[PDB]
Chains A and B, each alone.
Chain A
Amino acid sequence: GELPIAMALANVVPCSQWDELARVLVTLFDSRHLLYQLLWNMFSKEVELADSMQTLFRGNSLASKIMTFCFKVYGATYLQKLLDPLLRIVITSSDWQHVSFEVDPTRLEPSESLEENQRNLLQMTEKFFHAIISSSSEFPPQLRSVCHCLYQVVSQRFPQNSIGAVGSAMFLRFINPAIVSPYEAGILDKKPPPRIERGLKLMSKILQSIANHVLFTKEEHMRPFNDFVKSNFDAARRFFLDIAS
């Protein structure tokens, strides 16, 4: 019926129009209560073709476009309720000692202390990380099924990377874009001050490192956070397992 028609026509849309294709596909099949079946087929098509996890969802990936659309339309209420109280705390903090997150030594003011800013950044990252992994009871049910469907499909072929795939997707395509740009995400009514934006971006880099199970090896100034990253791998996996199994 509807699924083979949609699969065949999806080939015809050039990748430049895939944002619109993902919207229309999800909208069409959700209104027919067939969203799980759409995701199973779209995910399986790509997963069955890949020979390794490193080559899955790379480049133009209609499955990836569909997933980021689902996060946006099914996860807005959850995201706003989760991040807004946290962002309001860091935005209204009165500690001017605890007000800088600059941890790149080449950008550091002589007035500020690198080790203090590192600790400041780590404390914010801990509050955000702990809130995220404590939020499973509030996760939207339709988004839970999106993540479970991805987990089940990937597990048929790459069982040892199926939970990492959910975890990476949820931070990369859902949580971290909103932390980095909370105003444009519609969570805040005002863009945060630049010192705060700097901290939000650096924290999101640490959260993504935890979510992806990769240590910092590129930027020199990020490696000091590798011990914090390692210490949170297991809690992150337990959270992803709760959401995806």
Chain B
Amino acid sequence: GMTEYKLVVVGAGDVGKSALTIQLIQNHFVDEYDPTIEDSYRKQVVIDGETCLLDILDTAGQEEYSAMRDQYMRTGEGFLCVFAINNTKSFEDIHHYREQIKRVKDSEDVPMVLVGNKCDLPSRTVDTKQAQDLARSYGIPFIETSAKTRQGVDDAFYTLVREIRKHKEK
């Protein structure tokens, strides 16, 4: 049959949360101005030979909408924490997302995956080693992606599903 996974994509504005999601859901890349308030998707995929149903919440990076984080952090079971490799502030924001998720769930064991997006660009301000050290500190996977070329997109979502499943099978 089929297990349901509640994924939530979080991160600063314009890091590519929606572009990553739309590659997975609609198999194209759009370069348009369309800031998210909150979008919801569902998709059935096969991960490790098991059919899975993905419930994907694509959240607002614009800080004016920060009041709705508490709700979606309560309902999500795993979090794709996305920064852009050319935006130092978005990298630093990862710590704030992680600490709010840990408070709201009252846990230090929350499934999450660190995603460094826009790796197709030669404009990099966050070194891969810096991101690997942060992920290693948190004990979570780190994946470099490009929503524009689709590099790493499926692996980012599938890795989060596998972290959630590991957590549910404890």
A59, A60, A173, A208 — which one has the most chain B CB atoms within 10 A of its CB? A59
Residues from chain B with a CB closer than 8 A to the CB of A184 are 67
Is there contact, CB below 8 Å, between A214 and B88? Answer: no
Cβ-closest chain A residue relative to B61: A59
With A59-B14, A181-B68 in contact, do A14 and B37 touch (Cβ < 8 Å)? no
Whole-angstrom distance between the alpha carbons of A104 and B57 in the complex?
A: 13
Question: B26 to chain A: which residues have CB within 8 Å?
Answer: 218
B87 in contact with A173 (CB, 8 Å): no
- Kindly list chain B residues whose C-beta atoms are within 8 Å of the C-beta of A204: 37
Name the A residues within 8 Å of B14 (CB-CB).
Answer: 58-59
Chain B residues, Cβ within 8 Å of A19:
63
Taking a contact as CB atoms under 8 Å apart, the answer to whether B68 and A219 are in contact is no
Taking the nearest CB of chain A, how far is it from the CB of B140, in angstroms? 22
Complex contact A212–B34 (CB within 8 A): yes
Contact of B40 with A180 in the complex, beta carbons under 8 Å: no
Q: How far is it, in angstroms, between the C-alpha of A184 and the C-alpha of B31 when the chains are bound? A: 32
Per-position binary interface string of chain B over residues 54-85, scored 1 when its CB falls under 8 Å from any chain A CB and 0 otherwise: 00000000111101100000000000000010
The distance in angstroms between the C-alpha atoms of A173 and B66, with both chains bound, is 12
Q: Which of B112-139 contact A (CB under 8 A)?
A: none
B32, A205: Cβ atoms under 8 Å? no
| A contacts with B: majority SS | helix
Q: How many pairs of residues, A versus B, come closer than 8 Å at their CB atoms?
A: 64
In this complex, how many residues of chain A approach chain B with their Cβ under 8 Å: the count is 29
The answer to whether B37 touches A59, judged by C-beta atoms less than 8 angstroms apart, is: no
Known interface pairs A205-B37, A214-B34. Does A59 touch B65 (Cβ–Cβ under 8 Å)?
no
Q: Does B22 contact A (CB under 8 A)?
A: yes
- Contact partners of A218 in chain B: CB under 8 A: 18, 22, 25-26, 34, 39
Closest to A183 in B: B67
Name the residue on B nearest A179 (C-beta). B37
A185 to B62, CA, bound (A): 15
> Is B155 in contact with chain A by the CB < 8 A criterion?
no
Q: A54-B32, A181-B68, A212-B33 are contacts. A172–B62 as well, Cβ < 8 Å?
A: yes
Tell whether A108 is near chain B: CB-to-CB under 8 Å. no
Residue of B nearest to A68 (CB): B64
**Residue with the greatest number of chain A CB neighbours at <10 A, chosen from B31, B33, B40:** B33
- Please, what's the 1-or-0 string for A198-213, where 1 marks a CB less than 8 Å from any CB in chain B? 0001001100100010
Q: B39 contacts A180, CB within 8 Å? A: no
C-beta contact mask, A48-65 vs B, less than 8 Å → 1, else 0?
A: 000001100011100000
User: Could you tell me if A180 and B37 are in contact, using CB atoms closer than 8 angstroms?
Assistant: yes
Q: Known: A180-B37, A212-B33. Contact between A14 and B89, CB under 8 A?
A: yes
Is B39 in contact with A219, judged by CB distance below 8 angstroms? yes
For this complex, 20 residue pairs linking A to B, each with C-beta atoms less than 8 Å apart, are A14-B89, A53-B33, A54-B31, A54-B33, A58-B14, A106-B42, A168-B33, A172-B62, A172-B64, A177-B64, A177-B67, A180-B65, A201-B38, A201-B68, A205-B37, A205-B38, A214-B32, A214-B34, A218-B22, A219-B39
